[PDB]
Amino acid sequence: HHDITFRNIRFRYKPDSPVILDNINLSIKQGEVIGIVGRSGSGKSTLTKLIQRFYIPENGQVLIDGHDLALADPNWLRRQVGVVLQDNVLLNRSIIDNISLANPGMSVEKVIYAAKLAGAHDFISELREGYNTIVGEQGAGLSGGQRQRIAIARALVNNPKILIFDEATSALDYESEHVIMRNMHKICKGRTVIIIAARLSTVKNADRIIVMEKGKIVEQGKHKELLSEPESLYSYLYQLQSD
């Protein structure tokens, strides 16, 4: 079964604005973990915005879980997709409030489950005020890597069938990165996952990597196969980011 399909998608942000996505064709199997790489401004984040129907394409269709999103219930769509946001944990609010910031009636049990997958439960549990800890500075002083694991738990709490990782805007501490990489298979288990990767190394082990350039998918495949394509943009990017 395919959880996500783009057919002939053309998109621009405003009536006269430049075309940002052109003739995008992609079909992602249920449970696939996809990495999307490409230079800044290639259209990676825009592709994810369309999955959520934040914007409507001028040509083509997006189909989610088989449903054309034009026809799909927007409430159902919002429940199908969890997004790991960057730098979006609310400082003036508690950890649990941050994690359940979609369904405030969210069971403590559901919150802790999502926190365990995210690898946040352990550090939260060792805080004086636990889940009731106010995230904010002088209110506790959590790190960016701790906050990022909180952001993962938030994304996971409603058990989304599709999980999207927005591009990383900062480096996290070794501890937090280690916990996340160790827990990734648990976080992704049973879900279709899209990771927008600043560094190609991040998605070396994805089922498939999609390479975007100037709003088109130029290359797609497994890491080893993309490196086998003689003059591939993938290899070029791989070389550029290499030590």
Ligand X SMILES: Nc1ncnc2c1ncn2[C@@H]1O[C@H](COP(=O)(O)OP(=O)(O)O)[C@@H](O)[C@H]1O
Cβ proximity to ligand X: between 85 and 140 the closer is 85
The radius of gyration of the chain from alpha carbons, rounded to an integer in Å, stands at 19
Give the number of C-alpha atoms closer than 13 A to the C-alpha of residue 223, restricted to the C-beta side.
11
Cβ proximity to ligand X: between 30 and 88 the closer is 88
Which SS3 state, helix, strand or coil, does residue 166 take?
A: coil
**Is 44 known to sit in a ligand binding site?**
yes
Binding residues for ligand X (CB under 6 A): 13, 20, 38, 40-46
Query: Among residues 170, 193, 198, 171, which one has the least CA distance to residue 183?
Result: 193
Cβ proximity to ligand X: between 44 and 121 the closer is 44
**Is 45 known to sit in a ligand binding site?**
yes
Residue 30 CB, shortest distance to ligand X, in Å, is 24
Q: Are 26 and 210 in contact (CB under 8 A)?
A: yes
Cβ proximity to ligand X: between 38 and 82 the closer is 38
- How many residues make up the chain in this entry? 243
Residue 26 CB, shortest distance to ligand X, in Å, is 15
**Is 43 known to sit in a ligand binding site?**
yes
**Is 176 known to sit in a ligand binding site?**
no
Tokens of residue 95, six digits:
């950890």
CA 77 distance to own-chain centroid: 15
Cβ proximity to ligand X: between 20 and 83 the closer is 20
Residue 16 CB, shortest distance to ligand X, in Å, is 11
Residue 44 CB, shortest distance to ligand X, in Å, is 3
**Is 42 known to sit in a ligand binding site?**
yes
**Is 39 known to sit in a ligand binding site?**
yes
DSSP 71-121: TS-HHHHHHHEEEE-SS---TTSBHHHHHTSS-TT--HHHHHHHHHHHT-H
Residue 196 CB, shortest distance to ligand X, in Å, is 6
Binding residues are 38-45
Residues at the annotated binding site for ATP? 38-45
